[model samples]
Target: SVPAGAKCRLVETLPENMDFRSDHLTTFECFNEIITLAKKYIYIASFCCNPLSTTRGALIFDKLKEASEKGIKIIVLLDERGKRNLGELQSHCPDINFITVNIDKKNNVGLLLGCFWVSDDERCYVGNASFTGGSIHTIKTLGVYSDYPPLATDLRRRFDTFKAFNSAKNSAANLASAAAALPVSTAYHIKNPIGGVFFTDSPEHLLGYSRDLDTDVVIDKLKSAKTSIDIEHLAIVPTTRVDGNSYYWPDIYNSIIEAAINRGVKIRLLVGNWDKNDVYSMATARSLDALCVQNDLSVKVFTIQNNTKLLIVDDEYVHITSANFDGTHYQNHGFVSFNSIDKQLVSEAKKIFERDWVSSHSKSLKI
Candidate 1:
């Protein structure tokens, strides 16, 4: 575990556009290093884990098996929907513990967030990437490696909640306790000159209902913006508000963006072009463009062929999370939203956003 009160620098996965594909500290490298360095325990919570035939393939499972043989505790938590060779994994590493959470047990649908890897309680890697080889190698994903004690502690706590929820003999009381222990948005802050970090969860796991903390925090950032709001995410869906009497309510999610734009906040959105010809994408683009035109606000949309989730406001606050702007993600998913006021972190994120904004790979969406 990180020593008490130890300050750690944040490390990020290098961007692919920078031609650093062979960098030693890539996401795969970092995962391998964390596993290799772990002595006490290694915990991983991921949405998917289909091993690939690439050079980075099967290395993670191999490392975990080796660590289990070395007497180090290895715990893996996965969403129940993903295709994983867990039987083979368990056969190789009998000592390792594996637990799966059916996140959509209430609705019979799949709803998982992203990936988090914690090594011996000393360090954490959290990001938008999955555990698959494509996410690590080919996808334009971002994650942070931090040895910050408080941050690691909170992450471990969250993991423990999932562990408890997946336990065979868990009771209602246990579930309630686990839910109560979840870290909300107010439990974090840096002690130094810069504002500390705040960790926000989806609240579905805790409340058994949607609290929309992920969207709420994003809207809060937009509301606090003075000059600009830069958002890059895998997807965005227009959500409806709760109204039994009226049929007309602005898209709850997009309405906030409209409000921010109305306030003269320059909104630049970089969305993953999963399907450029999809009707949903075209409609969303048209709606946003019309909203901008009607309000005479400055708003631009660009499509990037990568899965990166970022929210930056006026270069002062930045959020890195795994939640997309879809209803499932908003209503029933597990996500961690990390916010920071660190100037260096904010500036670095802004630089990356600007690079993508101007890159040829990103195409402007004209309404």
Candidate 2:
């Protein structure tokens, strides 16, 4: 397990029409800085990519190539889209390590939804920043940037885990033997002296790696919250179609409802404009709206491409994740920090949510 010493803060990218406060840290700048400083290694897990022609997107690649030219070891984990987006980088920097996770015995189908960057085991960027060509400027992405060595090293180790998994899962017998001997994840779990824990996902049974799904982690945090819950997610669906059946996933949704009803807790939900059309998000927002009393629960549908899946409960527990309410391909990771102990990171996270709450794009969800 790793120890914590990262001076962490919240970093995000806003759409061109959105506000840009001085306190805000941009993900592009954060990533650019990380790559610029790394003399030893760079490990990045970038899922959901846009074209490389976007200004910030190409700049990111340009920076990585610059580092590679200096002989810095770089490993990039990308899914089908990433392979295409950064495909030219390998041609330019032949020494760079580019990989994608295996799915259905396939390596290129793409399963990376986690977006993070680790440099030299001394710094890291974790959150929801997609590495699209113009994504850094057009979409809203929120993530964490820090100078924590222990967690940085552990993240580097995770990239290695994927590296080994990709190499060994070729032959059937190799897959069997590799799964049997896979080591437990060496991710960090710390408290008291600046604390937080990692929540990574994979097919643990096959990969021999420990992981957690987004639903369970969100539910656990919500269930434990005593007073407040603030959320900013692009989508939140309470049901999924299976066997042609409309089945409601009750735990995560019900838990939020129960929190307000049972303990008089307060909640604020800021969802993307996409919710304006989707029947699933519409229904859930309506359900929560019905319980809007004591200002117990408030719902806002924002016009911004506010692609945040952030959760802050009681302003003391913070969760920043790349996983979504409606998708998990065993291809994501996130972190939870106790603000009561690790005040800096959690507070910065809370500020981002609060800042969005007051923005103009959000409004009462009447539907």
Candidate 3:
């Protein structure tokens, strides 16, 4: 049974197609709606914010500032290195609270894993898109706007946890220690009868040398697959070697995928091809395609012009996440939603996946 006030829908930021569609809402429009609907508080966690140059960016920033001036409690948490002119924004809107999370010397590891927006702790938006103009206007991005109270509260708690760390003026050492000492897993259960299980990757766990909970969940689900798996991501690398380390990580994930294929579970992988000049992505895709052929597995791999991170299993369980398939995301702060029983949400996701799978811009790999 669906919860009383729970609802979910697919949203996207697509390239300008020949025929403009009126049914879909762009990321810019979605952000606007989220801000407009907030009555008491507006909480945002993003990898970065640079809403000055683009028209949509200016619109969003202006709206946020307006909301702040209207006495709305606006709290924004950003990556220390990713934010541009945030100090200026803070000064302009004195009431708005802005904080940054820096977990490592590189100013990369501790950054917020994904982008999110919460309105009055009742509505929320989660996706891979950032607050920058390029991500909004140029990138092909997808996200979900949900009115599930449990999911909203779960994201709020994540914001509070990070806010606490920021307010404590804790050192990197302290942050690492706190993260290490934190619980290994936190579950978020939605009210729907089919139910949902949401999990977030703890910064401390990601920062330390350990398998990320998000990754573990993904792998476990893939391993348990009996029918089919559909994955759409910005990038997918089979394995990653860090700092010249001899041992490559995420090999286990790759192995799991291969095993699923061996068991006759049909798999389709769709990757973003917006950056045609991205040599690294091309190489990774080619390598994975070759691996599939070597294993005598029937896995369809295609490169499409999109920036969505999603996984669907047997059309029953759906995962919309901010983390990519790359191993580096294991240490980054990110969020993932696993809806085990929401038919509307899962069906919409499946439709989107199929649409992209057959799009003219999607090219079948021959490697």
lDDT of 3: 0.64
Cα lDDT tens digits for candidate 3, 1-367: 6462256666677757412133566788888988888899998877777666567777888888899989899988776776577876677677888877654434434456557788887888877767766557666777877777766766676665555445345543245666555433233533222245454454444423322366666677778778878888765665544455422355435744665557767777776552456555566666667766755333345443355788887787788776676666664454444344466667778888888777666667654
Candidate 2: where are CA atoms >4 Å away?
A: 1-5, 81-83, 86-89, 103-110, 167-174, 190-215, 241-247, 274-278, 293-295, 327-341
Give lDDT per model, in order. Answer: 0.62, 0.65, 0.64
What are the TM-scores, per candidate, against the unseen true structure?
A: 0.80, 0.84, 0.81
Over the stretch 1-367, how does candidate 1's per-residue lDDT look in tens digits?
4232234233344445443232224677777877888888888887776545334646766776789889988887777766366675567679888776664444545445547777777777777766666666666677666666567666676566455445345532235554465543233433222134556666454533322356566666667678877888765646322223212223335545655556766777777553565565567667767766665343435443365788888888878877765665666677676677766767777877777677666666665
Worst window of 10 by summed lDDT in candidate 2: 332-341
Worst 10 residues of 1 by lDDT: 240-249
Give the per-residue lDDT digits (tens) of candidate 2, residues 64-167: 87888789988776655445645566676687777755432432322555577788889987777766655577778788777878666766665655554443
- Which of candidates 1 and 2 is the stronger one according to lDDT? 2
lDDT of 2 at 56: 79
> Could you tell me which residue pairs clash in candidate 3?
113-333
Report model 2's TM-score to 2 decimal places.
0.84
lDDT of 1 at 84: 62
